[PDB]
């Protein structure tokens, strides 16, 4: 989460899915849309084509906010349903 050879404008973020192996630490320039970690997710768990649903904070992510739209910081941690 805070290794120190992480870039300080980076969020490292922890992406959980339904089950323990459906997991990813993905780390994302503040400047990234959600977007980029939603389908980063998909593409490296095989997931694509599922319709998953990524949640932070209890809301659903369109994709299209910025971290610092919804407060989301390093560290924090994104639920994906389905």
């Known amino acids: 989460m805070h290794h ?4 300080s404008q980076q969020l490292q973020l922890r992406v959980q ?6 997991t ?3 780390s ?3 400047d990234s849309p959600l977007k980029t ?3 980063h997710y ?3 768990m095989g997931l694509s084509g599922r319709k998953l649903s990524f949640f932070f904070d209890g809301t659903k992510l369109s ?4 971290p610092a739209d919804l407060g989301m ?3 924090d941690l994104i639920e994906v349903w389905g």
């Not at 899915?17 to 459906?22: A, D, F, I, N, S």
């Not at 994709?63 to 910025?66: A, N, P, T, Y």
């Open 4 to 7: 120190h050879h992480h870039h």
């Open 17 to 22: 899915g339904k089950e323990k192996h459906q």
């Open 24 to 26: 990813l630490e993905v």
């Open 28 to 30: 994302l320039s503040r």
């Open 37 to 39: 970690l939603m389908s």
């Open 42 to 44: 998909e593409e490296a």
């Open 63 to 66: 994709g299209r906010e910025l």
């Open 73 to 75: 910081e390093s560290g």
